[PDB]
From Swiss-Prot:
Its main location: periplasm. Its cofactor is Zn(2+). The gene is VIM-7. It catalyses: a beta-lactam + H2O = a substituted beta-amino acid. This is Metallo-beta-lactamase VIM-7.
Amino acid sequence: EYPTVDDIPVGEVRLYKIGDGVWSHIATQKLGDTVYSSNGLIVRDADELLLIDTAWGAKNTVALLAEIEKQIGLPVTRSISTHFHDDRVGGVDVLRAAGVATYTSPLTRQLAEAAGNEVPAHSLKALSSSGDVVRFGPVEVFYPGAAHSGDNLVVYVPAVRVLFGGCAVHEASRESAGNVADANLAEWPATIKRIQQRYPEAEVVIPGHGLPGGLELLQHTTNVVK
Ligand SMILES: [Zn+2]
C-alpha cells in the first residue's frame, strides 16, 4: 500500500496517511532508464497545512497541490524544504505562486542559490549549529549536523511521534550511499546518533526516498555510510 514507482501513474503525486493529521507525499522523476520516487510530509495545524518539501520539480508540485486539495481540502499555507537539492526546493516557485510562505534554513537558501536552484523566501533562524531545534507550527525542525548534505534538516511531529528524516536517512532496502557529491561522510554517523538521541520515541521514520520504517532506519543509515 505505500506508493511506489511501480504503481504511481506517470506524472501523478500520491498521498499516504501516516498518522493523525500527518501524510507523506510521494512523487516520481525518471532519470535515464530508472524511475525514482521521493517523499515529503504534510502536517495539519488547525485548519491549515504545513508542507515539508516540494514534490521534486514544478510539474510535480502543481500536481501535489491539486492532490492535497482533492484528498484533504485544506490550504497549504507554509512550507519547509529540508535541504537545497531539487527534490526539496524544486517547485518552490510553484508554492510561491500558490501563496505559500516558503521556508528553510539560511544555509539551505545559500546552497540553493549557489547551485542555481529555487530558493525558499524565508529563513528559519536559530538553526545554524549542529543540535539546534526550533518549533514551527505542529512540528519541530532539527538541524542534526552534516550528512547527505551540509544543511540537511529533519522534521518531527511530536503529537504522533513521526520523524521525517529526508535524505539523511536511507530506506531499509538501500545498501549504497548514493549521491555523495554534497555529503559529509565523516560527519554522517555523528549526525545519525544525534537524531537517535533526540527522538528516541519516534514510531515512524520516513526516508527521503523509499519506504517508511521505524527507528531501525537510523542505524541502517550509519551502516550503509561507514
Ligand atoms: Zn539531496
